[PDB]
Design a protein around this ligand. Structure first.
Ligand SMILES: [Zn+2]
Lengths: 62, 246, 118, 339, 125, 135, 62
RNA sequence: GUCCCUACUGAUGAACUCGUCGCAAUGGUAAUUCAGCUUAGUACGAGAGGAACCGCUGAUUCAGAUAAUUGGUUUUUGCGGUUGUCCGACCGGGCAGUGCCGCGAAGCUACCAUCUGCUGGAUAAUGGCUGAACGCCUCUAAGUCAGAAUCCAUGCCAG
C-alpha cells in the first residue's frame, strides 16, 4: 500500500483541502468570527503614541 | 422482459430485491446501479422503494408479499415500517408478523392468487397471511426442500421450480398452483431460484451469470418479452436444452 | 407497460436516471440520497419533518393509533364519572398511645443494650 | 513501545501546553484558536448516520461521547511576540483592570496567609492617567510584534469543584493584521468569551491533556495531544433541554441521574465530543483547532443526534428522569407516609 | 428507535444497555442488567422473585385492568404520517401519563387503606 | 481466491484455532473442528480466531462415517461468545455453530438448523437463501 | 500550469491538436515536455497502447 | 581441574528573591499491510477471461489514550444462604491464619470493551528541456524540469 508520506497521496490530500474542506472551514470561520466580533463590540510622550523605553550581554564591555 | 443485473458484484437478485405486481423493494447500498436497472425496466409504472429490513440488505429474502399486501418480520423497526408505508400507496396493506421463522422470503412464495408456505408456520400466521394477501395458503415442500421461498419463483403467468423436481411433484404443484411449472436453473447451475431471481407478470431480473439457454427458458415460462413464450417454445426447441444442459 | 418506451443509453432525451444524477451530484461514496423524495403524503410539505419517537420514557410509535380522539374523549368522560362517583375522595388518644408504645420500645432497646453491655 | 514518547516522564505541568498554534495568514477573519474546559465524564448517544459508502449508512449507530464543562472564559491580558534568529520572543504583555480573585489565586501559592498585593500597582497605572504607558505598550505590540495571544482564565467558582484557583493560558489570535488583532484583544478585555463562539457543532478539534497516573518507571501523568475528535454538540446550560433532541421531546439536562460520578452537575455551557479524551474527570482540558485543513469526509459530516443518555452512572441504571422513574414505579411507603 | 422492556424484570431497556440472548428455537430475550441475565441463566422464576413486575402482576400488586393502560399496545400496522396526528398524539401522551400516575396513587391507597386500625389496635394491646 | 470476506466490521472473536463446533446443516456432519482461519494475521504466539461470518477450515469429528475425517471450508453462523453490533446491542448465541461451504460461498446442504447470524446472512447470499431464522 | 509568457490554444485547423507558443524557447519546450510527461501510460504494453500527447512540429511563429 | 565501581533511566535536589506566562538549542520520532464499493464486466481480448487513475468504506499489525456500554477480579469480608464447635436457649455473635457458596457496587481492567494516529522541501534509479564538447548528434559540460515507502524538517514527546 502507498505510505502516508507518499507524494501522490499528498497531492490528493492537497486537492481535497483546496476543493471542499477549504470552503467549509472558511464558512464556519466566518460565522464564528462574526459572533466573536459582536461579543467584542458588545503630545506623544505624555499620550503613549510615541513608543519610548519602559521604566549577560551581546557586546564586549569596553 | 428478462434482464441481467448484480447487486454489487453478486448474482443473487432475490436476496437483495423483492418484485411484485404493484411495488418494488431494493436494498440500499453504496451506488444506485441496482435501483437504476430496476427503474429503467420499471419507469415509474409502480413505486420502487430503497428499503432496509432489520438493518440488513437481504430485504429480498426477508420480505414476502404480493400486489395486495406486504409482510415484514417482527425484527423490522418502526422507522422502517414508516418508510415502507410512506413509500407505498394505500392500495397495499403492510403488516409486521411475529413468525418464529423470520426469513419470510425464504418460507413463503406468493403470487396474486396462491401462496406456498413452510409447513412449520403457526396457525395465527397462516390465516393472517390469508387475510393480508387475500390468497389461498397451502403447505408443501418442493424437491424435498422445505424452503419454498428460496427454491421457487412464482408469478401469475408461470413458475420456475428446482431443477431436480420429479415429474409427479411438478404436475401436482401445477395442479395446485394453476400455472405452468418448469424445472430450470438460474445463474449457471445455481439451485436457489428465489434467491437468484425476482420476477413479476412483465419483468424478470436475474444475475449476470445466468446463461442464454436458461434465460430463454425463463422468458418462455413466464411469458416475457412479448413474443410467444408459452412453454410450447420450450417443448418445441428442445435441441438447445438437450445440448446445453445434458 | 404497453404504453411505455424502451430506455436506450444512446438516446439523447432519455430519462434522468439515478446513475446520471449521482454522477452529476458526486460519486459513489459521496452522493447522499434523500429517502423522503418518493414519500407520498397528504400534504407535500410534511416531508422532511422530524418524527417524534420518545416522550418521557414511553414510545410514540407504540402509542400511535388512528382514530384516537374518540377514545381520548371517552377517557376524560370516564375520568369525570369517576371523580363524581368519588373514586378520588381523600379520607389524640391514639397519638399518645403510639407515643407511649414508642417510649416503651426505646426503654426495651436500652435494656437490651445494657444486657449486651454486661 | 514507541521511541517517540520514550524516555517516559511525568508532565512538568498539570495544565498541559499547546506547543503549536495553527499557521496564521491575514486573509482569514480575526478569531481565537484555543479554549479550556473541565472533563465531567462520558455518556452514550445514538446518531442518525449519514455516512455514504459505509455499512451503517442510513442506520442508527450507538457511540460513546465525552462531556467537557466549559464555563465562559474571561480575558485578562494581551501578549505580543516578535521573531528573532533565536526564535519567538515574548516582547511585551499588557494586563487589564480588575483581575479576578481566582486568577490572583493562580498567581499566589499560599493565598490565605498572603496580603493579596498583586497587580495593585498595575491597577494604579491604568487608573492614574498612566494610560499613556498602557497605550505605549499597546502601540509597541502594534508595530513590533508578529503573533499576538490573549491571556484567558476559567471560572472555578462556576465549575462545581473544591478548587478555587483558576487556570490561565495564552490563546493565539489568527486571521488578521497585527493591528486588527491587538485592537480585537483590547476590546475583549474584561469580557467573557464563550465556547459556542470559539468552536461550533460539527468541528473536529484537538484535545491536549495529561494522562491518568497509574502509580499506587512513570506510567501515566504524561502530556498528550490527541488529534481529530468531532465535537458533536455545544450545550447552553440554561437551555433546560440540553439533552433533548428533535426525535425525543424530553426536557432533560446533560447531567445524569444523581449527578456525574465524582464530578457533580454540569450547569454551564458544555461540549459533547466523540470518543475518548486524555485525562481523568475534573482535570483541566485544552481545546484547540486543527493545525491543517482536514482531508476526510468525517470532518464535513453533519451530526444528527437522536437521544442522549441521562441514566445513572453510579450503577446499572435505567431511567432517564426522576419523573420517568416515578411513572414506572408508582407510589411508595415513604411517599404515602410523608403525604 | 424503541424502548425495550426487560424480559426478566420489565424495567425500560434503553439502547446500549444489557445483553441479548439468542436460543436455537428462534426467540430472543433482551436483558437490561447483568443481574437479570444471571438470574435467567440460573433459572429462577421471575413470577416468584419478588423484585419483578411479572411477580407484581401475578400477585396483584399493580393495576392491570384499566383503559388508560389499554391505550398502549404493540403496533404492527403502520400509519401514514400526519403532523396534526402526532401533535394531538403527544398531547394525549401527556394526558394519559398524568392520568396513569393519579389512578396508580388511588390503586395503592385503596390497597392499603386499612393500616391505621391495625396499628392502633397493636398499640392498645 | 482467498475466502476473506469484505466489508466485515469489528466484532469480538471467541472461537480460536482448534475449536469444537456444532454443525447446522443437513450435510451429514454433527461437529466441526476449527484448525485455521482465513484472513488471520500471524502475531507472536497469537492464536487466530473467527467471528460470525468469517470463513475457517474445519475437520469433521463426528457424523456420517463416509464424510467423517474429512476437511472442508466452513463459515460460522452462531457464536456463544458475546459481541456488540453497531446499534450498540451486545448479543450472544446458545452454542457455536457453522455450515459447510465451498470456497466460492455455496452450501453443500439444503437447510440450516436454527437461527443464522445477521453478519453471515449479509456477507454470504447463499446462507441468506438457506436460512429460515435470521437474528 | 504553463510557464509565464506561454500561450496555449486548441486551433481549428486540424483536429486533436494543440499549439503552444511564446517568446522563450526554454519555457515553450519545457511546457510541451510537461504535457508529454504528464500524459504517460503506466503498467501497460508500450507496443499496444498508443495514447498520449506528443510534440509533432517545432518552429517559429513567423 | 581458582558487595562496590561505572553505564541506562525515571524520581528528588542546594546556589539565581519567590511565583505566573512563554521561547526553543539539542536529543528522540511512527505509522504498516490488506480488502470491499464505484470506475467496470469497462479498456483489452477469437474465446476464456479481465485491469488501473480519481473518489468512497472497512479490516491486520504497531503506537498513544479511555471506561459511557459489555464482560471479568472482591478485605467493601456490602447484602443473602450454609457446615463443625462454643456463648444455658432466641436474637445477636466468636473461632475454622478471609470456612464454603450466590449476587455484588466503587476501583481497576480487557483488540473480551471503546476512541485517535497529521505535511512541506531536497533527492537515488530513471524520464526529460535548452545546448557545447565534436559545424551531425548528445539529459551535462555552464543552466534547468520531474520523480521512490528514500533523506531533512513540521505535526508529536522531552526541555
Ligand atoms: Zn435487568
Amino acid at each position: 500500500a502507498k505510505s502516508a508520506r507518499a507524494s501522490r497521496i499528498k497531492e490528493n490530500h492537497q486537492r481535497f483541502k483546496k476543493n471542499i474542506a477549504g470552503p467549509v472551514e472558511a464558512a464556519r470561520l466566518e460565522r464564528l468570527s462574526a459572533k466573536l466580533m459582536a461579543i467584542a463590540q458588545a503630545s506623544g510622550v505624555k499620550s503613549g503614541k510615541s513608543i519610548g523605553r519602559k521604566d549577560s550581554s551581546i557586546v564586549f564591555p569596553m | 422482459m428478462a434482464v441481467r443485473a448484480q447487486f454489487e458484484n453478486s448474482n443473487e437478485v432475490g436476496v437483495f430485491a423483492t418484485l411484485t405486481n404493484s411495488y418494488c423493494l431494493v436494498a440500499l447500498g453504496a451506488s444506485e446501479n441496482f435501483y437504476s436497472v430496476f427503474e429503467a425496466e420499471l419507469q415509474d409504472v409502480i413505486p420502487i422503494c430503497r428499503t432496509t429490513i432489520a438493518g440488513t440488505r437481504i430485504i429480498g429474502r426477508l420480505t414476502a408479499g404480493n400486489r395486495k399486501g406486504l409482510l415484514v418480520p417482527t425484527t423490522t423497526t418502526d422507522q422502517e415500517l414508516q418508510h415502507l408505508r410512506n413509500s407505498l400507496p394505500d392500495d397495499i396493506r403492510i403488516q409486521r408478523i411475529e413468525e418464529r421463522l423470520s426469513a419470510l422470503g425464504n418460507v413463503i412464495v406468493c403470487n396474486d392468487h396462491t401462496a406456498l408456505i413452510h409447513p412449520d408456520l403457526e396457525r395465527e400466521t397462516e390465516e393472517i397471511i390469508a387475510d393480508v394477501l387475500g390468497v389461498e395458503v397451502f403447505r408443501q415442500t418442493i424437491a424435498d426442500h422445505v424452503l419454498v421461498g428460496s427454491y421457487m419463483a412464482l408469478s401469475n403467468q408461470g413458475g420456475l421450480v428446482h431443477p431436480k423436481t420429479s415429474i409427479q411433484d411438478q404436475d401436482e404443484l401445477s395442479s395446485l398452483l394453476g400455472v405452468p411449472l418448469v424445472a430450470g436453473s438460474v445463474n449457471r447451475g445455481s439451485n436457489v431460484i428465489g434467491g437468484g431471481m425476482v420476477v413479476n407478470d412483465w419483468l424478470a431480473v436475474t444475475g449476470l451469470d445466468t446463461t442464454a439457454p436458461e434465460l430463454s427458458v425463463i422468458e418462455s415460462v413466464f411469458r416475457l418479452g412479448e413474443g410467444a413464450g408459452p412453454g410450447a417454445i420450450n417443448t418445441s426447441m428442445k435441441n438447445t436444452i438437450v445440448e446445453s444442459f445434458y | 407497460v404497453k404504453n411505455l418506451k424502451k430506455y436506450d443509453k444512446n438516446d439523447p432525451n432519455r430519462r434522468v436516471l439515478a446513475r446520471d444524477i449521482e454522477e452529476a451530484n458526486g460519486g459513489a461514496g459521496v452522493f447522499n440520497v434523500d429517502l423522503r423524495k418518493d414519500w407520498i403524503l397528504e400534504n407535500p410539505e410534511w416531508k422532511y419533518d422530524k418524527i417524534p419517537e420518545i416522550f418521557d420514557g414511553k414510545n410514540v410509535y407504540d402509542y400511535i393509533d388512528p382514530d384516537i380522539d374518540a377514545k381520548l374523549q371517552a377517557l376524560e368522560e370516564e375520568e369525570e364519572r369517576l371523580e363524581k362517583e368519588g373514586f378520588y375522595d381523600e379520607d389524640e388518644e391514639e397519638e399518645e398511645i403510639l407515643q407511649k408504645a414508642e417510649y416503651i420500645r426505646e426503654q426495651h432497646a436500652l435494656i437490651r443494650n445494657e444486657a449486651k453491655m454486661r | 513501545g514507541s521511541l517517540a514518547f520514550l524516555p517516559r516522564k511525568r508532565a512538568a505541568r498539570h495544565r498541559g501546553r499547546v506547543k503549536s498554534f495553527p499557521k496564521d495568514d491575514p486573509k482569514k477573519p480575526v478569531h481565537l484558536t484555543a479554549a479550556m474546559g473541565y472533563k465531567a465524564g462520558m455518556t452514550t448517544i445514538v446518531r442518525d448516520l449519514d455516512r455514504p459508502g459505509a455499512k451503517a449508512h442510513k442506520k442508527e449507530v450507538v457511540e460513546a461521547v465525552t462531556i467537557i464543562d466549559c464555563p465562559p472564559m474571561v480575558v485578562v491580558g494581551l501578549v505580543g511576540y516578535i521573531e528573532t534568529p533565536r526564535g519567538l520572543r515574548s516582547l511585551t504583555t499588557v494586563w487589564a483592570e480588575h483581575l479576578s480573585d481566582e486568577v490572583k489565586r493562580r498567581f499566589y501559592k499560599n493565598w490565605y496567609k498572603s496580603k493579596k498585593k498583586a497587580f495593585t500597582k498595575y491597577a494604579k497605572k491604568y487608573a492614574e492617567n498612566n494610560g499613556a504607558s498602557i497605550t505605549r505598550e499597546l502601540e509597541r505590540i502594534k508595530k513590533y510584534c508578529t503573533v499576538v495571544r490573549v491571556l484567558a482564565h476559567t471560572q472555578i467558582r462556576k465549575t462545581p469543584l473544591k478548587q478555587k484557583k483558576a487556570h490561565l493560558m495564552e490563546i493565539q489570535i489568527n486571521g488578521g493584521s497585527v493591528a486588527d488583532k491587538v485592537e480585537f484583544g483590547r476590546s475583549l478585555f474584561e469580557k467573557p468569551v464563550t465556547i459556542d463562539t470559539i468552536f461550533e457543532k460539527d468541528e473536529m478539534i484537538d484535545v491536549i491533556a495529561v494522562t491518568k497516573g497509574h502509580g499506587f518507571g512513570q506510567m501515566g501523568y504524561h502530556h498528550r495531544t490527541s488529534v481529530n475528535h468531532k465535537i458533536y454538540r455545544i450545550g447552553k446550560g440554561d437551555d433546560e433541554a440540553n439533552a433533548s433532541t428533535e426525535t425525543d421531546l424530553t426536557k432533560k439536562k446533560i447531567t445524569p441521574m444523581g449527578g456525574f460520578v465524582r464530578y457533580g452537575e454540569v450547569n454551564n455551557d458544555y461540549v459533547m465530543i466523540k470518543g475518548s479524551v486524555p485525562g481523568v474527570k475534573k482535570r483541566i482540558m485544552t481545546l484547540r483547532k486543527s493545525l491543517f485543513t482536514h482531508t476526510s469526509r468525517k470532518a464535513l459530516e453533519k451530526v444528527e443526534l437522536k437521544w442522549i443518555d441521562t441514566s445513572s452512572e453510579f450503577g446499572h441504571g435505567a431511567f432517564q428522569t426522576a419523573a420517568e422513574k416515578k411513572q414506572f414505579m408508582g407510589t411508595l411507603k415513604k411517599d404515602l407516609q410523608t403525604s | 428507535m424503541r424502548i425495550e422492556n426487560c424480559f426478566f424484570c420489565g424495567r425500560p431497556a434503553w439502547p446500549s444497555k444489557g445483553i441479548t440472548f439468542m436460543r436455537n428455537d428462534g426467540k430472543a430475550f433482551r436483558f437490561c442488567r447483568s443481574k437479570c441475565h444471571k438470574n435467567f441463566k440460573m433459572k429462577r422464576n421471575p413470577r416468584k422473585l419478588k423484585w419483578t413486575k411479572a411477580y407484581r402482576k401475578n400477585a396483584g400488586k399493580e393495576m392491570v385492568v384499566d383503559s388508560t393502560l389499554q391505550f398502549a399496545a404493540r403496533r404492527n400496522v403502520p400509519v401514514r404520517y400526519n403532523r396534526e396526528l402526532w401533535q394531538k398524539t403527544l398531547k394525549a401522551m401527556e394526558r394519559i401519563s398524568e392520568i396513569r400516575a393519579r389512578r396508580e396513587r388511588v390503586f395503592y391507597k385503596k390497597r392499603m387503606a386499612g393500616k391505621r386500625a391495625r396499628e392502633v389496635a397493636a398499640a392498645r394491646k | 481466491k482467498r475466502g476473506a470476506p469484505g466489508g466485515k466490521l469489528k466484532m469480538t472473536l471467541g472461537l480460536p484455532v482448534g475449536a469444537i463446533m456444532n454443525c447446522a446443516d443437513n450435510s451429514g456432519a454433527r461437529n466441526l473442528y476449527i484448525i485455521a482461519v482465513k484472513g488471520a494475521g500471524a502475531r507472536l504466539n497469537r492464536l487466530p480466531a473467527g467471528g460470525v461470518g468469517d470463513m475457517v477450515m474445519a475437520t469433521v469429528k463426528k457424523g456420517k462415517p463416509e464424510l467423517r475425517k474429512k476437511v472442508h471450508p466452513a463459515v460460522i453462523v452462531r457464536q456463544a461468545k458475546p459481541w456488540k453490533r453497531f446499534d450498540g446491542v451486545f448479543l450472544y448465541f446458545e452454542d457455536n455453530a457453522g455450515v459447510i461451504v465451498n470456497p466460492k460461498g455455496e452450501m453443500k446442504g439444503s437447510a440450516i438448523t436454527g437461527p443464522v447470524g445477521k453478519e453471515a446472512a449479509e456477507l454470504w447470499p447463499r446462507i441468506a437463501s438457506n436460512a429460515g431464522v435470521v437474528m | 500550469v504553463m510557464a509565464p509568457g506561454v500561450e496555449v490554444e486548441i486551433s481549428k485547423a486540424q483536429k486533436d491538436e494543440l499549439i503552444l507558443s511564446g517568446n522563450s524557447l526554454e519555457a515553450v519546450s519545457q511546457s510541451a515536455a510537461d504535457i508529454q510527461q504528464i500524459c504517460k501510460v503506466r503498467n501497460k504494453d508500450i507496443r499496444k497502447f498508443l495514447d498520449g500527447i506528443y510534440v509533432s512540429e517545432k518552429g517559429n511563429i513567423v
